[PDB]
Design a protein around this ligand. Structure first.
Ligand SMILES: NC(=O)c1ccc[n+]([C@@H]2O[C@H](COP(=O)([O-])OP(=O)(O)OC[C@H]3O[C@@H](n4cnc5c(N)ncnc54)[C@H](OP(=O)(O)O)[C@@H]3O)[C@@H](O)[C@H]2O)c1
Ligand SMILES: O=C1c2c(O)cc(O)cc2O[C@H](c2ccc(O)c(O)c2)[C@H]1O
Length: 324
């Protein structure tokens, strides 16, 4: 059948298109700039690209820009999003286009008449951004926007855009009887086919790079393998019993435990053994994917799989040095 993937050039977008095409789908991939070779070459290089892949130019900031790509589609994966953590105008450059793009895409599906399910890639940032951390999160849990805006931790504007966009979308979907499903990944880690540094790998490989500003997201961290996640998107689109929100997270551990694993696998890098404000007694925080596994979904990869894939790929593409 015929599906649209928004933001197909990116980390999740491009891997999802690959798996989709492999599964026999016809894919309509959207990008902002089709002339950018670093954004599209990895898509065009996929098997079945000549026969089963089309490219479409679209930006979330433009009203109606996804109408054409979505008309005719049986399904839509809305993966595209503005990823700047360092914007001087968050409201206009990030929050507004994330929310309005989301609702625009839902309207574009409504206009199409052909789309039987819309799947949105939400964010764990919409779940556990509050001052006190519960031991385990599920799909009933939503972030505290007052706390997020006040604290301005790393990625706050991103977390706001994703939370507000999902709540807006559920409002629209309830009021228009739209078959809408959200997937809530934690930190996505693994090998990849894009040519530049995945945004989430900035965070995930911060113990190696020393990007201490990203430690706050992995201090009590949760993880999911790129391929498991992309398989979950396909699974939830296909499973007719699917409803509501779905956490997709396979592992949780504190930064201490992550860095240990990394130190052991990669002696060549300067990975710390101690982190400011972090103790061996710090609670690990779990995102429970029980709702997802209860449907019958199975995770297949380990934390070690994720990080080895990540680092090995980064090296191959000259995004990480061979050693320090
Ligand atoms: N990776 C993770 O750990 C993680 C965790 C939870 C949720 N997510 C969610 O997963 C989705 C994809 O994340 P990702 O890691 O794959 O990030 P990514 O590599 O940055 O992919 C995002 C894509 O969005 C596109 N984009 C940016 N601004 C746009 C705009 N204004 N209009 C249309 N497209 C725009 C970009 O493609 P072009 O430049 O070609 O237009 C980019 O390739 C996002 O919805 C994100 O919130 C990711
Ligand atoms: O969207 C996400 C994301 C991302 O796209 C890029 C990035 O660099 C870091 C990120 O981190 C998010 C996250 C993981 C675990 C949590 O407990 C949490 O609150 C947030 C993740 O969901």
């Amino acid at each position: 059948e015929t599906v649209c993937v928004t933001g197909a050039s990116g980390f999740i977008g491009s891997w999802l298109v690959m798996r989709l095409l492999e599964r026999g789908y016809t894919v309509r991939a959207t990008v902002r700039d089709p002339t950018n070779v670093k954004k599209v070459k990895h898509l065009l290089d996929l098997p079945k690209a000549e026969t089963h892949l089309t490219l479409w130019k679209a930006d979330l900031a433009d009203e109606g820009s996804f109408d054409e790509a979505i008309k005719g589609c049986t399904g839509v994966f809305h993966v595209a999003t503005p990823m700047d953590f360092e914007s001087k105008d968050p409201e206009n450059e990030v929050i507004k286009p994330t929310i309005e793009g989301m609702l625009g895409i839902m309207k574009s599906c409504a206009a199409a008449k052909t789309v039987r399910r819309l799947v949105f890639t939400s964010s764990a940032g919409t779940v556990n951004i509050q001052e006190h951390q519960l031991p385990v999160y599920d799909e009933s849990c939503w972030s505290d926007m007052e706390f997020c805006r006040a604290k301005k931790m790393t990625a706050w504007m991103y977390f706001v855009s994703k939370t507000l966009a999902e709540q807006a979308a559920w409002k629209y979907a309830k009021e228009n009887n739209i078959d809408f499903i959200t997937i809530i990944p934690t930190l996505v880690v693994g090998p990849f086919i894009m040519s530049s540094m995945p945004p989430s790998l900035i965070t995930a490989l911060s113990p190696i790079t020393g990007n201490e500003a990203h430690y706050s997201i992995i201090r009590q961290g949760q993880f999911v393998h790129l391929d498991d996640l992309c398989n979950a998107h396909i699974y939830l689109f296909e499973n007719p019993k699917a409803e509501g929100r779905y956490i997709c997270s396979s592992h949780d551990c504190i930064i201490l435990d992550l860095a240990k694993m990394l130190r052991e696998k990669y002696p060549e890098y300067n990975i710390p053994t101690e982190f400011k404000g972090v103790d061996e007694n710090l609670k690990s925080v779990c995102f429970s994917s029980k709702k997802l596994t209860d449907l019958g979904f199975e995770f297949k990869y380990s934390l070690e799989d994720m990080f080895t894939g990540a680092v090995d790929t980064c090296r191959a593409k000259g995004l990480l040095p061979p050693s320090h």
